[PDB]
């Protein structure tokens, strides 16, 4: 009557063996909805910050990709103004062989290595390409403003 074994499995392993630097907790009403916090990675301009993300497992998971979005404002060429994440495995390259944990790891890695070279990078990419020092400082400024509480 309930969730597929795979979802029970992934949920329970997430709470038993969390990814370092990532907290992931179930929603109180929806068993497919998770509230995630990702620590800014070591040596990134997001370091010291904590970033809220939400994750949803749609009906067709794992045939369908999990849905993920930042809910904390972040200055990054691959995360847009509404928190949407450009990550190939959330669209093009999703497959049932991948799992939730792979996604969270990929997102952490994206914060550690932003990609302003991506064709679909937002308008922040130009700044990252041409004045990387300033862009990194702006990312730190936004970490101070939005990601410290």
């Amino acid at each position: 009557a309930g969730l597929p074994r795979r979802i029970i499995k992934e949920t329970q392993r997430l709470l038993a063996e969390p990814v370092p630097g990532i907290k992931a907790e179930p929603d109180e009403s929806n068993a497919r909805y998770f509230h995630v916090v990702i620590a800014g990675p070591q040596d990134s301009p997001f370091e010291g910050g904590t970033f809220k993300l939400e994750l949803f497992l749609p009906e067709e998971y794992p045939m369908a990709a999990p849905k993920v979005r930042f809910m904390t404002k972040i200055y990054h060429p691959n995360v847009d103004k509404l928190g949407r994440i450009c990550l190939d495995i959330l669209k093009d390259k999703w497959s049932p062989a991948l799992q939730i944990r792979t996604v969270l790891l990929s997102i952490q890695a994206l914060l550690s290595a932003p990609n302003p070279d991506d064709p679909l990078a937002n308008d922040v990419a130009e700044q990252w390409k041409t004045n990387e020092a300033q862009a990194i400082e702006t990312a730190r400024a936004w970490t101070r403003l939005y990601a410290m509480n």
Partner: protein, 140 residues
């Protein structure tokens, strides 16, 4: 019964709004493109032909609260309109007087609300109401 959480539903509605639907006589989008809460939307309704609303663009504010879409959004006209169910001094849409809101289902959406209001503009009780001057808006 798998419910899609509010924010992911609203992202779906954002994408549909950008793609547009039907003949484009209703449209919707975020009021502030930096609003991560996805709460405040702009609605547009083209007044339907052969009514006193015809050839007028109606702008609306649609607010999707914390319980959307289990609960209906709040809707107010910005453009002044005389129409049953719309407070004629403030533009507020009275949910109890508009069937899509009064009988809200979680399958409904901002699109559906705007389409319903446009359909109701063609109702016998509305289509001949004399209107305020074109382009006038409510305060606040």
């Amino acid at each position: 019964g798998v419910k899609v959480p509010r924010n992911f539903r609203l992202l779906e509605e954002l994408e549909e709004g950008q793609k547009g639907v039907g003949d484009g006589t209703v449209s919707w989008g975020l009021e502030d493109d930096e609003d991560m809460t996805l709460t405040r939307w702009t609605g547009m309704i083209i007044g339907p032909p052969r009514t006193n609303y015809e050839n007028r663009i109606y702008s609306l504010k649609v607010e999707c609260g914390p319980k959307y879409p289990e609960a209906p959004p709040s809707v107010r006209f910005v453009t002044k309109i005389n129409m049953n169910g719309i407070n004629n001094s403030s533009g507020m849409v009275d949910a109890r007087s508009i069937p899509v809101l009064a009988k809200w289902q979680n399958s409904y959406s901002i699109k559906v609300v705007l389409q319903e209001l446009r359909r109701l503009m063609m109702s016998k009780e509305n289509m001949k109401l004399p209107q305020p001057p074109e382009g006038q808006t409510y305060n606040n």
